């Protein structure tokens, strides 16, 4: 995160850390959606240009974390994956279209003051909130500048209109993506940045005041550049896919 602040404790209890056993190191962010299911960016697992192809055995999922680096002895819970599921039509060859994946935990995690799932949007929730101008919140332990924070960082950013999104870049933008950030005029800064990938873009419903995950940190060019925006996986558009695997494989 760029230009964000330290999270308060228990502010984002669905925040997960994707963790490499060896070298043990931070892979990406992720989110807890139930006691056995984690949502991440498919590019955190599979990205051939960079020679990335993780298997279950390669990873650890860390939940209830605050510190980037320490093992939080009576707070965090570490889990093993039972299974990874990537969007069959994820496009790693051109634009990261459908950048989403689900991870099934070996054993269900117990909820706590620090560990609690986020909701998945519904058509009407998506309808009223996914609006240009409306702000969302991003969290992660990624790069501070286009180095690494000691504690979880948070930033609030406004949703931007499709055309502006589209005119900011040469990559082909699809309906499975939205972009967020301030306009250079606007004069407020903030962005996600490398290492933030796979983390949640959440909004708080003013109707039932629950936290909903609208997006997943996906890609950008640079971090906090003026005239540029972060891109996120549009979670609602991909809901059915999600519905499908949970319903065909777990819970």
């Amino acid at each position: 995160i760029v230009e964000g602040s330290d999270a308060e404790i228990g502010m984002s209890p669905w925040q997960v850390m994707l963790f490499r056993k060896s070298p043990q190191e931070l892979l990406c962010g992720a989110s807890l959606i139930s006691d056995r299911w984690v949502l991440t960016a498919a590019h955190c697992l599979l990205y051939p240009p960079w020679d990335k192809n993780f298997t279950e055995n390669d990873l650890l999922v860390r939940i209830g974390k605050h510190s980037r680096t320490r093992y939080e002895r009576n707070i965090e819970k570490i889990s093993m994956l039972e299974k990874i599921y990537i969007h069959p039509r994820y496009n790693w060859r051109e634009n990261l279209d459908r950048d989403i994946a689900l991870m099934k935990l070996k054993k269900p995690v117990a909820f706590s003051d620090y560990i609690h799932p986020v909701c998945l949007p519904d058509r009407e929730t998506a309808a009223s909130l996914l609006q240009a101008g409306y702000k969302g919140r991003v969290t992660g332990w990624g790069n501070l500048k286009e180095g690494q924070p000691s504690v979880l960082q948070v930033v609030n950013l406004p949703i931007v209109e499709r055309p502006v999104c589209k005119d900011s870049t040469r990559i082909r933008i699809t309906d499975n993506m939205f972009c967020a950030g301030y306009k250079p005029d606007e004069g407020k800064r903030g962005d996600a940045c490398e290492g933030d990938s796979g983390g949640p873009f959440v909004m708080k419903s003013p109707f039932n005041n629950r936290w909903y995950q609208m997006g997943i940190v996906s890609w950008g060019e640079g971090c906090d550049r003026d005239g540029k925006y972060g891109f996120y996986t549009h979670v609602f558009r991909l809901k059915k896919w999600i519905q499908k695997v949970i319903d065909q494989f777990g819970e």
Partner: peptide, 10 residues
């Protein structure tokens, strides 16, 4: 600079 984790985990 990652502090070490419980071998029960790996």
């Amino acid at each position: 600079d990652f502090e070490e984790i419980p071998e029960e985990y790996l």
